[PDB]
Amino acid sequence: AQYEDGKQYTTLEKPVAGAPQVLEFFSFFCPHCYQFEEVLHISDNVKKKLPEGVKMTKYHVNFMGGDLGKDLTQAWAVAMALGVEDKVTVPLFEGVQKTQTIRSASDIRDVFINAGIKGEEYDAAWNSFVVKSLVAQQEKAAADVQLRGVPAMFVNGKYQLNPQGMDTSNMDVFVQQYADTVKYLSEK
């Protein structure tokens, strides 16, 4: 077959019920995740090939970067609650991996302030029980699928993208193969 289990994707030995249709995991400490966001624009290219009414979910993980990794998962919950993911993703990535100007929760907070989220608004979100359950959702979703690596994408709780089994000579060809695989799995 042109698409093969064990090749462009793998199947979960234990499938996950009730899962988001397209569920993506990342860390701001994760070097390929940086690529996926800034250089490859994976999430955006997957979206463009999916139908609409296909909801796309993106969660942060704890297992990289110790105490600051956990702060970032809470910050991502704040971003999701306020709907400002597209304003903080790039400066959070660059602040962690490029300029290395993010070393504490206060430095994360600075990124949101510079992006125009109000101090009062951020701190209230940071401390809200809506963000707490949002942190729990991110944790439970990663726990459900036995997650020890990012970037990771899961389709309908059964299929796991396998980018190592795709061509990387050309970055654009890689992205299309990746998005086409998600579309394939989506239709499965």
Backbone as a ProteinNet text record, in pm:
[ID]
protein_1_A
[PRIMARY]
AQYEDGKQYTTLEKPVAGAPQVLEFFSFFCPHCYQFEEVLHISDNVKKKLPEGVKMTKYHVNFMGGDLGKDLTQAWAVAMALGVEDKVTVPLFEGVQKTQTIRSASDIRDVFINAGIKGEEYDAAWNSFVVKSLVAQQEKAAADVQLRGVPAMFVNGKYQLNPQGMDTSNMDVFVQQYADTVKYLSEK
[TERTIARY]
84.2	0	87.9	31.6	111.6	126.4	19.7	29.6	33.2	129.8	146.4	156	88.6	117.4	263.4	329.6	472.8	553.6	487.9	566.2	548.8	429.7	406.8	332.3	289.6	214	226.9	191.9	188.6	51.7	7.2	-125	-109.1	-194.7	-184.6	-230.9	-142.6	-179	-299.6	-306.5	-429.9	-486.9	-591	-654.5	-721	-734.7	-794.2	-932.7	-1034.8	-1171.9	-1198.4	-1285.3	-1330.9	-1227.3	-1118.6	-1005.6	-1040.6	-966.4	-973.8	-935.8	-1000.5	-977.4	-829.8	-774.4	-632.7	-573.8	-487.9	-428.9	-279.2	-224	-82.1	-12.5	105.1	177.6	310.6	349.3	479.2	540.4	666.6	724.6	800.7	802.1	879.4	1029.1	1065.7	1206	1247.6	1148.4	1165.3	1215.1	1337.6	1400.7	1328.2	1273.7	1197.3	1065.5	1009.5	884.8	903.2	1019.5	1055.4	1049.5	1111.3	1109.1	965.8	885.6	746.5	664.4	696.8	625.5	679.5	808.8	865.5	900.1	953.1	1010	916.4	850.7	763.6	615	571.1	430.7	339.1	373.1	297.7	151	121.4	-18.2	-100.1	-41.7	-114.5	-134.2	-36	-48.8	-139.4	-141.7	-239.6	-380.8	-404.8	-535.7	-587.2	-501.5	-535.3	-580.1	-550.3	-583.7	-696.3	-726.7	-843.2	-972.1	-1086.7	-1212.5	-1232.6	-1344.4	-1360.1	-1461	-1466.9	-1542.5	-1458.4	-1333.1	-1238.4	-1165.4	-1174.2	-1112.6	-974.4	-888	-746.5	-706.3	-641.6	-603.1	-450.4	-393.9	-250.3	-221	-149.3	-116.3	35.2	71.8	210.7	239.1	365.3	397.9	496.3	495.5	578.4	715.6	735.4	855	984.5	979.4	1103.6	1117.6	1238.7	1275.5	1236.2	1218.2	1186.8	1084.3	1122.5	1024.6	967.3	1053.7	1009.8	921	942.4	852.9	710.4	694.7	562.8	502.9	586.5	535.3	483.6	550.4	510.7	376.9	350.3	223.6	111.3	137.3	36.8	18.4	128.6	121.8	48.8	67.7	-5	-155.3	-188.6	-327.9	-379.9	-299.9	-344.7	-367.9	-273.3	-289.2	-417.9	-445.9	-564.8	-691.2	-691.5	-808.4	-839.4	-735.3	-749.7	-757.9	-733.6	-734.7	-622.1	-503.4	-392.1	-272.2	-298.5	-194.5	-112.9	-178.6	-103.3	-20.8	-34.7	43	164	161.5	271.1	358.8	313.2	388.2	527.7	539.8	673.3	764.3	718.9	812.9	842.4	753.6	786.7	894.7	875.9	981.1	1117	1118.5	1245.3	1305.8	1221.1	1269.8	1330.6	1272.2	1335.9	1458.9	1447.3	1556.4	1655.9	1613.7	1702.7	1772.9	1696.6	1761.4	1790.4	1725.2	1733.1	1715.1	1604.5	1572.7	1458.4	1412.9	1312.5	1369.8	1378.4	1438.3	1346.9	1234.8	1144.2	1001.8	907.5	766.9	747.6	826.9	814.3	857.7	961.3	999.4	892.6	827.4	711.9	602.8	567.9	470.7	507.6	636.7	682.1	645.5	660.6	621.9	476	386.3	243.8	217.5	285	269.8	313.6	428.2	477.7	382.9	313.6	216.8	84.1	74.5	-48.3	-156.9	-131.9	-222.5	-195.3	-300.7	-286.6	-242.8	-154.1	-102.7	-209.8	-305.3	-422.5	-493.5	-503.9	-573.7	-494.9	-364.5	-278.6	-276.3	-251.8	-238.9	-368.2	-481.1	-610.1	-628.2	-596.2	-600.5	-506.3	-379	-279.2	-331.4	-404.9	-449	-590.7	-656.2	-795.3	-811.5	-924.7	-955.9	-991.4	-1025.3	-1043.3	-908.5	-803.3	-669.6	-622.1	-650.7	-618.1	-674.2	-802	-859.4	-799.7	-761.7	-700.1	-560.3	-488.5	-361.2	-386.6	-489.3	-525.4	-560.3	-626.1	-663.3	-539.6	-444.3	-317	-244.5	-242.5	-175.1	-245.9	-378.9	-451.7	-439.8	-445.7	-431.9	-295	-189.2	-55.7	-47.3	-104.3	-102.1	-178.5	-290.9	-374.1	-299	-209.7	-147	-2.6	38.4	169.9	281.4	279.1	366	503.5	609.5	745.9	826.2	760.1	831.5	745	806.6	745.9	843	793.9	653.7	576.7	445.4	365.5	230	174.8	41.5	-39	-163.6	-247.5	-378.6	-423.8	-547.4	-658.1	-768.4	-883.7	-851.2	-743.6	-702.5	-650	-632.8	-583.3	-448	-419.8	-303	-199.5	-72.1	33.3	124.9	136.6	219.9	361.4	428.3	565.8	656.6	699.7	777.2	911.8	970.5	1097.1	1082.9	962	943.7	898.3	934.9	897.6	1027.5	1023.5	1140.9	1174.2	1302.8	1344.4	1448	1464	1558.8	1503.5	1371.8	1302.7	1199	1207.4	1122.3	977	950.7	813.8	748.6	827.1	778.6	748.4	832.4	808.1	675.5	650.5	525.6	401.2	404.3	289.6	265.5	372.9	356.9	294.8	338.8	288.9	140	104.8	-35.5	-122.1	-74.9	-149.4	-168	-71.3	-89.5	-197	-199.1	-303.3	-439.8	-448.6	-576	-617.6	-522.8	-547.3	-602.9	-535.2	-575.9	-712.8	-735.6	-861.4	-979.8	-959	-1061.8	-1078.5	-982.1	-975.4	-1087.6
-119	0	124.4	238.4	360.3	418.4	412.6	442.7	311.7	295.2	169.9	198.3	118.8	123.8	83.9	151.2	136.4	217.9	292.2	374.6	527.8	580.5	725.8	753.4	644.5	650	515.9	515.2	391.2	387.3	270.8	262.9	237.6	299.6	282.5	143.6	69.2	-59.3	-43.6	68.5	101.8	232.7	223.9	343.2	428.3	559.1	651.4	702.6	668.9	711.7	856.5	922.5	1057	1162.6	1119.1	1206.9	1316.9	1428.4	1526.8	1465.4	1510.5	1457.8	1465.3	1585.5	1607	1666.3	1589.3	1631.4	1637.3	1755.7	1779.1	1811.3	1753.8	1784	1849.3	1949.4	2013.8	2059.3	2102.5	2177	2296.7	2407.3	2521.8	2495.5	2384.6	2343.8	2249.1	2202.2	2098.8	2156	2119.7	2175.4	2144.5	2024.2	2000.1	2074.9	2098.3	2175.2	2319.1	2374.3	2505.2	2508.3	2407.3	2390	2382.2	2297.8	2270.7	2398.9	2486.6	2613.1	2719.6	2753	2868.8	2847.4	2729.1	2697.3	2614.5	2516	2425.2	2461.2	2526.8	2567.2	2447.1	2337.8	2211.6	2230.4	2288.1	2293.4	2367.2	2470.4	2550.9	2474.2	2393.9	2322.2	2201.2	2137.2	2032.3	2088.3	2201.6	2268.6	2288.3	2343.3	2374.6	2251.3	2130.8	2011.4	1931	1963.7	1908.7	1976.9	1907.4	1978.6	2082.5	2153.2	2244.6	2184.4	2236.4	2167.1	2050.8	2048.6	1951.9	2034.9	1994.5	2079.3	2025.5	2120.8	2100.2	2139	2048.8	2078.6	2072.6	2167.1	2170.3	2187.1	2090.2	2089	2092.4	2160	2169.4	2052.6	2011.8	1901.3	1939.1	1861.5	1891.4	1829.2	1720.9	1640.4	1700.2	1820.3	1889.7	2019.8	2044.9	2172.5	2192.8	2082	2084.6	2186.7	2272.1	2358.4	2458.3	2507.4	2601.9	2534.5	2405.8	2333.4	2332	2311	2314.6	2454.9	2557.4	2695.5	2721.6	2664.1	2686.9	2618.8	2502.4	2432	2513.3	2574.4	2665.8	2792.4	2848.7	2964.1	2930.4	2808.4	2770.8	2761.4	2709	2707.4	2851.4	2947.4	3088.1	3137.2	3106.4	3145.3	3089	2961	2895.5	2958.9	2986.5	3047.4	3186.8	3263.5	3402	3409.1	3295.7	3287.8	3364.9	3362.2	3439.5	3355.3	3228.5	3137.8	3197.4	3256.9	3308.5	3433	3487.9	3606.3	3572.8	3458.7	3429.4	3312	3233.6	3113.2	3145.5	3234.9	3265	3329.9	3436.1	3487.6	3390.8	3295.9	3198.4	3105.1	3054	2971.7	3042.7	3166.7	3238.3	3274.3	3309.8	3340.3	3220.7	3102	2980.2	2933.9	2918.7	2854.7	2947.2	3067.1	3157.2	3255.9	3344.6	3449.4	3408.1	3299.5	3246.3	3355.7	3427.1	3538.4	3493.7	3369.6	3316.6	3218.9	3263	3181.6	3162.7	3234.4	3224.7	3248	3225	3251.2	3399.3	3486	3630	3664.6	3598.8	3617.6	3570.4	3456.8	3413.8	3521.1	3569.7	3676.9	3798.8	3833.4	3950.3	3936	3813.6	3783	3816	3778	3811.5	3963.9	4031	4177.3	4251.1	4211.5	4268.8	4238.6	4125	4095.1	4165.2	4246.4	4323.1	4267.8	4153.1	4104.1	4186	4233.4	4320.9	4243.4	4303.6	4240.1	4179.2	4262.3	4220.8	4099.4	4101.7	3999.2	3869.1	3879.3	3761.9	3696.2	3775	3719.1	3656.3	3716.8	3658.1	3525.6	3522.5	3395.5	3292.7	3330.6	3241.2	3170.1	3243	3188.2	3130.2	3131.1	3085.4	2932.8	2883.6	2740.5	2694.6	2788	2751.5	2709.7	2785.6	2747.2	2620.2	2605.3	2478.5	2353.4	2355.9	2237.6	2224.9	2338	2339.8	2275.6	2299.3	2230.2	2079.4	2043	1902.6	1835.3	1907.4	1848.4	1814.8	1908.5	1886.4	1768	1757.9	1645	1513.1	1511.9	1386.3	1337.8	1430.2	1391.2	1329.3	1382.7	1326.3	1191.4	1184.4	1059.7	947.8	981.7	881.8	807.5	878.3	825.7	781.1	773.4	723.3	807.5	938.5	1030	1055.7	1016	1038.7	1118.1	1163.4	1242.8	1343.8	1458.2	1560.6	1600.3	1656.8	1682.9	1554.4	1557.7	1437.6	1481.6	1404.2	1427.7	1299.3	1308.1	1189.1	1215.3	1120	1140.4	1050	1110.9	1037.2	939.1	965.1	877.1	739.5	712.5	581.5	585	692.5	691.4	794.3	758.5	849.8	874.8	1001.4	1041.1	995	952	905.5	978.8	1101.7	1182.6	1122.3	1037.8	974.3	888.9	840.5	758.3	835	964	1049.7	1109.7	1164.7	1227.3	1367.4	1396	1526.2	1599.7	1559.7	1629.6	1767.5	1773.2	1896.1	1926.7	2045.7	2078.4	2090.3	2138.9	2157.6	2023.5	1933.3	1801	1726.6	1746.5	1685	1727	1858	1914.4	1860.2	1855.4	1802.9	1656.9	1579.1	1437.3	1423.2	1509.4	1507.7	1544.1	1656.2	1698.2	1595.2	1548.4	1443.2	1317.9	1286.3	1169	1196	1316.9	1346.3	1338.3	1387.5	1384.7	1241.2	1158.7	1015.1	950.5	973.3	912.4	961.9	1090.6	1155.9	1088.8	1047.1	983.5	835.5	781.5	638.6	596.1
0	0	0	-37.3	-41.7	98.2	176.7	318.5	395.5	484.3	558.3	706.4	787.9	929.3	949.9	1044	1061.4	962.6	873.5	780.5	789.2	758.5	769.5	898.2	961.2	1084.3	1157.7	1285.5	1361.2	1425.7	1470.5	1533.6	1683.1	1763.8	1907.6	1948.4	2014.5	2073.5	2166.3	2237.5	2306.6	2254.3	2169.6	2111.6	2219.9	2196.8	2294.2	2251.4	2330	2301.7	2339.7	2263	2295	2264	2201	2171.4	2070.8	2076.1	1967.5	1833	1726.1	1591.8	1551	1561.1	1538.3	1666.5	1731.6	1858.4	1845.4	1867.4	1847.9	1982.9	2008.7	2133.8	2102.9	2181.8	2163.6	2296.3	2291.3	2403.8	2349.4	2423.4	2378	2389.5	2454.2	2468.8	2356.8	2282.9	2179.9	2046.2	2007.2	1886.9	1756.5	1736.6	1613.6	1614.9	1734.8	1750.1	1703.7	1732.8	1681.2	1528.1	1467.9	1322.4	1271.3	1336	1298.1	1301.3	1396.4	1404.1	1309	1320.3	1248.4	1102.2	1073	942.7	856.5	918.6	843	849.3	956.2	968.2	947.1	1014.7	1010.1	1043.7	1160.8	1204.1	1100.1	1040.5	945.4	814.7	778	652.6	662.6	779.5	807	798.5	865.1	860.7	717.5	632	493.1	409.9	456.5	379.2	443.1	567.6	635.5	591.2	604.3	578.4	688.3	691.2	802.9	898.4	1020.5	1122.8	1172.1	1128.1	1178.8	1281.9	1408.1	1507	1533.7	1561.2	1569	1710.7	1783.5	1921.4	1936.8	2011.5	2038.5	2186.9	2243.3	2385.5	2413.8	2522.8	2569.8	2663.5	2677.1	2768.7	2877.7	2985.9	3102	3098.3	3022.8	3049.2	2995.8	2940.5	2908	2986.4	3034	3092.7	3236.7	3309	3451.2	3497.8	3592.1	3655.5	3552.7	3465.3	3362.1	3256.7	3230.4	3142.4	3194.1	3323.7	3384.9	3381.6	3399.2	3387.1	3247.6	3148	3008.2	2976.6	3036.3	3016.5	3078	3193.7	3251.4	3165.6	3114.3	3022.8	2896.2	2846.6	2726.7	2757.8	2875.8	2918.5	2920.2	2969.9	2968	2826	2737.1	2597.8	2537.9	2564.1	2508.8	2565.9	2695.6	2759.3	2704.3	2673.5	2628.1	2478	2412.7	2267.9	2203.7	2265	2211.6	2170.8	2138	2092.1	1980.4	1880.2	1766.1	1797.1	1917.2	1948.9	2035	2104.8	2197.6	2151.3	2053.4	2016	1966.8	1869.9	1822.3	1930.6	1999.5	2101.2	2216.6	2246.4	2350.6	2295.5	2174.6	2112.9	2104.1	2054.7	2038.6	2173.8	2270.6	2404.6	2474.3	2455.6	2505.8	2427.2	2294.4	2218.3	2147.5	2107.1	2031.3	2121.1	2182.7	2262.6	2405.3	2447.1	2582.8	2687.9	2672.3	2759.1	2848.1	2832.5	2924.7	3026.4	3151.2	3256.8	3377.9	3380.1	3493.4	3449.5	3539.9	3509.9	3477.2	3540.3	3512.3	3369.8	3320.6	3181.6	3082.2	3110.3	3028.9	3026.2	3145.5	3163.3	3077.3	3071.2	2993.5	2846	2795.3	2657.2	2629.5	2719.6	2702.8	2710	2802.8	2820.1	2694.1	2639.9	2516.1	2399.8	2404.5	2299	2325.2	2430.9	2449.6	2540.4	2602	2704.3	2828.7	2894.8	3011.2	3135.2	3214	3334	3422.1	3462.2	3537.2	3474.3	3342	3266.1	3267	3246.4	3255.4	3392.5	3496.7	3630.3	3677.1	3641.7	3678.5	3607.1	3478.6	3405.9	3466.9	3481.7	3541.5	3665.6	3749.5	3877.6	3875.6	3760.1	3749.4	3747.6	3798.8	3790.6	3648.5	3559.7	3419.2	3359.2	3389.2	3344.8	3416.7	3546.7	3615.5	3544.9	3506.3	3442.1	3302	3243.3	3110.8	3118.7	3228.3	3253.2	3269.7	3346.9	3366.5	3234.9	3144.3	3014.8	2932.9	2931	2862.4	2919.6	3053	3117.5	3086.1	3096.9	3076.5	2932.9	2837	2697.5	2670.5	2731.7	2709.6	2779.7	2899.5	2974.9	2903.7	2839.9	2771.1	2660.6	2591.4	2468.9	2489.5	2615.8	2654.6	2594.5	2620.1	2547.9	2609.7	2538.2	2587	2484.9	2377.9	2279.1	2206.1	2179.6	2096.1	1987.7	1875.8	1840	1821.6	1842	1826.7	1778.9	1685.8	1634.5	1634.9	1681.5	1693	1622.8	1540.9	1465.3	1520.7	1565.8	1617.3	1730.3	1803.9	1912.2	1874.9	1746	1703.3	1631.7	1557.4	1469.8	1509	1498.1	1541.4	1422	1383.3	1269.8	1293.4	1186.6	1198	1098.2	1134	1038.7	1001.9	1086.9	1051	926.4	897.8	779.5	656	646.8	533.2	476.2	354.5	291.8	346.2	371	426.6	341.2	215.8	130.2	103.3	92.4	60.4	168.2	228.1	341.5	302.8	181.8	136	104.1	46.7	14.8	144.2	246	377.8	439	439.7	491	418.5	285.7	212	239.5	248.4	283.3	420.7	512.4	647.9	645.2	581.9	578.9	504	389.4	319.4	402.7	488.2	572.7	675.2	730.8	827.8	759	634.9	562.1	538.8	496.2	478	604	716.4	843.4	888.7	866.9	896	825.9	700.8	618.4	652.6	727	759.1	852.1
[MASK]
++++++++++++++++++++++++++++++++++++++++++++++++++++++++++++++++++++++++++++++++++++++++++++++++++++++++++++++++++++++++++++++++++++++++++++++++++++++++++++++++++++++++++++++++++++++++++++

